[model samples]
Target: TEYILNSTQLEEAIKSFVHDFCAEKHEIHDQPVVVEAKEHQEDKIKQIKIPEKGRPVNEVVSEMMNEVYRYRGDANHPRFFSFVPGPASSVSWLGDIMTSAYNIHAGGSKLAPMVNCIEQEVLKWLAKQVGFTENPGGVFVSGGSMANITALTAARDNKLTDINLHLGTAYISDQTHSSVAKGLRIIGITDSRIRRIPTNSHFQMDTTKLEEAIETDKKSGYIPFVVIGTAGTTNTGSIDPLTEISALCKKHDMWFHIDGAYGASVLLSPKYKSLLTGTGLADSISWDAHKWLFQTYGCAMVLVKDIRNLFHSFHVNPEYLDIGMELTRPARGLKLWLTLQVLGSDLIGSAIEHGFQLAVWAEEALNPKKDWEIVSPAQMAMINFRYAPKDLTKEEQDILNEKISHRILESGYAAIFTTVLNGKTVLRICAIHPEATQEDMQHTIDLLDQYGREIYTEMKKA
Candidate 1:
């Protein structure tokens, strides 16, 4: 209880650090990116280990702010275009402070009715974007990974219950997020039960091959239970042929699940929504407001067209309600609900629309570089490309790109990730932050070339 209660001085100390962290934070372009050695980080943590005698709160808070928070990567940095940047708006996280203070819980039943209603309202907003304007039921989860798992759990309960877990196969593209496969493994499906179908040239799931795989599995007397599609793939942000995949799933009587954690916000644009045309046909969908919507982390939503299945999947008897905290979730939906209320759909929608424009701008800016090749013409606010200088062979180019990725991360001017597309290592960027204008795109490429050639020169010398 002593720890639970806080003094006014302690409150000011905590609030002061938070305000400073939020205020002093800079865009990735402004700050030098820093890295850590494992041994150094581990040693630092050991130094902070159990003090049986408690230190003053101010001292402890200062240590955490300086020693801990000071060293971490700022995912919210505007130039943090690496690994689906999390450029959460500063205004929105005020709700997170309130959520922490109130300590609300919405496990199964809504203890806070008004908060629950707000949660549902926010979910319906997601529902409409997903084209599930019908009675959509979803619960907020930690992130896209959890959202995918929650949806798959409902898929398992509703469809795969009577079948042998091994025989119940789920189809996914090789480019699909690793979490979906891991989710299946957690929920009693064997590794053999999952099919990692190959992607076509554009990194989209080959729907024709998908149908062929499903039929082949069924012919082998296996029960094909689910087909997972991606709206925004991490590697390339290439969406599968959703409409065709949907028709295939319906034809096979399989559960169609979509993992739209990164790209689902594209549904916000009347312009880009058609790119994800068959998204509405999914039986279950996972969307993360934290990524594209730019809300702080832990604002992911999992929606099922039929609410009962989701409820039944995770619901338990009142007597056993206190089982696992995983099932006994939190009233975390307030994060997005409050953010949405403050910002409104118009602001958010335009921000997302700007995200699309930024990607297009990035594509145009990069393509003119003689050695740079545009990957898939920047679909869904993301693009992938590689630098292949005329003097180098493809093998040498691969080695050069890998080195540049490491150098770019070490430089820390911007965050860019690398992925294997069509078996060649390439640079990829997803400009989910609306803060990025065409000017930002130009600056990003200039630095990319700056650091890339810097590394290339050093690599040749070595």
Candidate 2:
């Protein structure tokens, strides 16, 4: 039997949840505890047994919606500076809701013709943004990881044929996201085959070192097949020298893949687009709209200079699924299409500009202060810094950073992710939320100072 809530009841439930969650009406003290444990711990699994039958339809839907509505990351909050922030935009959310209501399967035209077409338009726009020519095209995947895998798969196949070799090697910077290594592993590339090039003072990949690595690898009889460059690295926000990398890729006839998952949106920002210069030289690019575009999660775009490469990698013609279809089909691009359409390209540009402005504001507020050192110049919206107390050993500094991170989490006023840079623990503030402001950053610095002082005082007593 079908169980449902009346339209009015459903509306009221949703409205109440939004009012409570969106308004942040609950006190920080009342905020739900951050569950860091695994999804199915032994005790949790024992307590929560699987049900034999599904719950009422309305009950299941309402419960799931409530869970999402109540989730907190401070990503949408103005004070949020932790991790890569995602500020949920009203328009994007509405578009996603509409898409869900339509219940269209974007996998093929027969399932949902218009949905597939919408997805294609979005992909085309993304291709153009990255400076892809008229023949550029791509597909929408689950996230940056998937997009990277898809792009690398294409590069792997293309390189195998171009070099006329079965075994191949891929190169990436030490600062590249872990996803790159994971992607290669999934594709059967062993760890020994992946080379991690060194980074320069700016934390960016050293093009000179990259050249040496390629030459050395080639001399060793290892086929140099693909080079992956980072547009925005996670820790320091360092961007590799694209022009140099592109030149090297061309000279060696290797496929160039730019993983701009977090920083690619800067292409829309007049202020930061220069960071992504030479992106046009890439054979493929992967970007995540969910991170910087303020879109709801699950939108990643992978673009190829030539659309046929994407098809060459993943297109499989199964007899059962090949009937009555055009030789060419629309890309599954709806989520991004609806998002970009609702929020114009200029708006995305403005959001990225705003993030850069805030990053600069953070640098001004924190740098030049005593006892604090800014690690790298704020590239895009990420600020890397650490507290250096006199007479403290590197081990002591690591312990202090860990305590400070935990304190910030306990305080519930703000959240900032911590990472080690140059063998010292550093706090990384990635200001990706569109709503974050200079004032919010100032408050963050204030909290850091307060907590840092407390930790120092407590240590002195010991």
Candidate 3:
């Protein structure tokens, strides 16, 4: 007996999955997140394995969908305000299907010549969006972390050779993504060589203090090899002073790298383009198209001012790589390219603008009555605020606010993420979903206060 299925069955499964995906995209907003971690029908996830005898395809596929989809949270859901949102456009999602279905191995020109061209065109489109006038080359990676690692590795190799290697020092602000330090460490930069600069009240890197760090490091005979600036921070969506940092790097002859993973896509919005005045000044940048560009996951690009530098660092020779694929990169560009083709830049830009406008509404409409405090102003599609009481002691207030966050999440009405600002936990709204509205923000805040009142009354009773 044949325990295997043929192409026709597999084709049907693909169509079924795509139909389910499209339906979910349209109405997922009604329930942004749902979790039944304990109630899953497949009580033992460990029991999911290959069976001795094959089962019916229809039953197997439906069970597979239910076991994964019904319980886990949906990223594309409109009300998903936690962390940065990666809302995949329908065309982009289907393009992902296209790429995977073809089994395109796009390592070299000879292996997949047309795919190589599409990747190049995608890179060119991104470079123009970033305001790059000269030759801009990039390697599309899996996401922000790998993009950072790739750019940092390029910086490490290009700047830290010879004597420069021994005296290397890197600069970053505390608001910078955690992956920066991790990427540096992955590239062999030791703990001591990395300097975590402090951000001012606005959550931007204190440039004056940053200069001081560089001067002190220089006086100690240390070579400042790189200065990493953030276009948009993960916590508050705050952008570092790239113009000033670029000037400092120029004066010190240091390589400048900007982690634009979470916020760089603001460049697309003509209203927010001024925010990135000096973006072109960066020697290298790491941007995740999946984050703000609304593409699906596994799409990020590491761009360089000078293409030769990347070639020098990553070019290699291998017999298999010899078949037209030279560098190591995944087949991750088709979805983004297809997205641009289908929606065009204007539609995507409006979605980004919606995120900005949504954040503005959150800050403006969130009548900070006696219960809430705005810890950070809205910037780059994010705002930070906390549920606080007027008469409670500072310690008690902190505990109460954190409890409110937990209660709201546990209530399952909405999903809001928490973060620390000056050591006190606060809730944030990372509203990048195209359909998130002022009503959503209002509802979430109402829940916070609702839960806050309940918790405080309970605590006071005890």
Candidate 4:
């Protein structure tokens, strides 16, 4: 049989198949966060290599239903409280499907002029929400890492001249994401010139230390060019003092770029918008719509106060190209734009409020338990706590917390994973899933308490 689309039968079948797959949205809540690979799963996967003869389309789809999606990992599950939990709304997924069906190149005014204009409007709207100027420049990108690199590339070019390129030094706090450093390295800034300013006791960038570092670098004839301020860190959701950092950048004539990949969604909440005060002062910002903005993966943006900076950094004279990281990229902003339009901004703000409330509820659930050590309380829909029985040593406590994390994952109750904070292992929960409820939070905490006790007992006996 020819594999090409030569008949309507296959088209109708595919449409029905997709409708069924998308219809069962409730299945997401019922299924476990991660279904561990069963026996002989590896062998079965290995046998799925490309075949010489063409197989029936229905048969291939059946095989995918069985083998491919069987042992699945769903980040959108209500109990998935791991690294920047993805809680994409189904509306966003529908928009994504529509975009994929069209497959339009959204680069310039030629083929996809409407979508390109929509992307610009969406970016400007987001900038306004965050208190930026009415017409701040931005571009939708793939993910947080790409957003950081794109913004930093422009920052480097806009701040550092060719003569002082080697002498240009960038600054970030200890709590800044590793992606910032990686972005700096990719743009030709070395480790020696990048100052990792130590954070304060509250886990904010120490402005005193930051000023001292800048003055010291200036005394040595080095130009302190860009300061990467973190809005919310991945480790414990710690936010640096943006206002102070902005003032320091102004004093030193440095570029201020806020990495708000995980915390920028707070702008949606009128109740919690104060947490991100002074956000509009930044020269550039990198944010992830997938993290907390109820959009699917690969949707993020880099916003700059001035549009010409990006053009100055990335403009090419190619006949078929435009300004941005990619010339022939998909309509990345369409899904988010549709989501915002369909759900309306007020409902989205409520969803963001729900994310913050979930973490606060989690904190309340864990606070009364004497055995649990709250390393970091709830902040920006994330919290960190560890199982610390008084009788157990620090090393034993670490091992116990790790054991609890693995056991909880194995139990298929949730995906609460562990991360290190101040050299101690702690279970971190990112409770931003839109559908998660109070009962879910309570049940997850109960499960953690039960598992920690059982695991600690087993370890003590051993």
The TM-score leader among the candidates is 4
Model 3, 1-462: lDDT tens digits are: 343535667678778877877687676655636454675466556678879877777688887676765676466766677645477777877887788778786675476788878988888777887767798788788888888877787788877875567688899999899899888887777779899999999999999999999999999998888899999898988889989999999999888999999777888888888888888999888889888888777688878887866766676744112111136455788888898888888888898899988888877766764567899988998999987777677888888877876676666666676788878888888888888878887777777777878887777633
Taken over the whole model, the C-alpha lDDT of each candidate is 0.78, 0.76, 0.79, 0.85
TM value for model 1:
0.92
Question: Candidate 2, which segments miss by more than 4 Å at Cα?
Answer: 4-46, 53-72, 161-166, 318-332
Q: Pick the lDDT winner.
A: 4
List runs of model 1 lying over 4 Å from the truth.
1-4, 25-30, 33-39, 83-85, 108-111, 318-327, 454-462
- After best superposition, candidate 3 residue 215: deviation in angstroms? 1.7
**Which stretches in model 4 have alpha-carbon errors above 4 Å?**
1-9, 38-43, 83-85, 318-322
User: lDDT by residue for model 2 over 135-246, one digit each (tens)?
Assistant: 9877777678888888888888777854344457889988999999899888767789899999998988999988998999899888898999999888877899999999
Ordered from best to worst lDDT, the candidate numbers read 4, 3, 1, 2
Worst lDDT run of 10 residues, candidate 3, spans: 317-326
Between the candidate structures 1 and 2, which one is better when assessed by lDDT?
1
Per-candidate TM-score against the hidden true structure: 0.92, 0.88, 0.92, 0.94
Ranking according to TM-score, highest score first: 4, 3, 1, 2
Cα lDDT tens digits, model 4, 74-145, are: 887888887554777888888888998887868854866898888888898988976677447888898888
Q: List the residue pairs that clash in candidate 4.
A: none
